[PDB]
Amino acid sequence: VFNRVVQIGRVVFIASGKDQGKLAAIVNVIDGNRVQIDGPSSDVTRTVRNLKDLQLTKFVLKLRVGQRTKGVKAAFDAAKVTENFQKTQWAKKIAQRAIRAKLTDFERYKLMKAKQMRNRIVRVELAKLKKA
């Protein structure tokens, strides 16, 4: 029933707190609530975080218990975890929201016009399909 697990080498996504929005790798498990993570190549320092702020990704690295920052960096770069993560809809939505949050007034106007024109055309096509 559960696929992703909290295991050494599991790549986690920081959902809230200090380094929000970044990726790290679980290098140790302290107790049922706390994990030692270290995202050397994603600008996350080796720290201990409460699992309540973390979310499990689909990537698991080939790490060792308490792998040092150098080894974590090597595994991260070898697996290309950042590139593979950037291909998921998880990361695409974050990128889209990042673009959206910084829209200027002119960009908002342009989006309004383009969106309504596209909706009108798609509605014409939908009427065609519905009639048939």
Binding site: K102, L103, T104, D105, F106, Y109, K110, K113
Partner: protein, 139 residues
């Protein structure tokens, strides 16, 4: 002393009017008038019907859009006294200054590849839509 202009207000910047009968209109900022410190702005009267007048910067949102304003040559007789207040009727003199000032502005917009959106953008009034919160909107 004259009032201190906000850093975002530079010639050619497009502002949003927040008060008056023209509230919500997008206009073009030309220059800070020396005497009063108000802003000589004119969203081309041709596009949005906003004539050449003054407005205080407190009632304006300065956006990041700028139109090429280097071509406009403001007549010397256009100053604070020119806009000083006397059934208002637009003097025939006034109309000519608007044509003189707007002509380079309109031409600059036309040359801009985005002239289609620029003309429509200046001809539309800003408004707060659904789930649009000013503290998270980047103007």
């Amino acid at each position: 002393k004259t009032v201190t202009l906000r850093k975002t207000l530079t010639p050619g910047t497009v502002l949003i009017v927040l008060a008056g009968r023209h509230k919500g209109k997008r206009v073009v900022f030309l220059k800070q008038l020396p005497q009063s410190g108000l802003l000589l702005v004119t969203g081309p009267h041709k596009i949005n019907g906003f004539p050449l007048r003054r407005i205080g910067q407190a009632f304006v949102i300065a956006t990041s859009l700028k139109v090429n304003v280097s071509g406009v040559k403001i007549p010397e007789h256009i100053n604070d006294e020119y806009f000083k207040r006397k059934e208002y009727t637009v003097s025939e003199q006034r109309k000519k200054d608007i044509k003189t000032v707007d002509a380079p502005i309109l031409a600059a917009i036309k040359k801009h590849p985005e002239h289609k959106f620029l003309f429509g953008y200046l001809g539309t009034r800003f408004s707060l839509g659904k789930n649009q919160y000013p503290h998270k909107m980047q103007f």
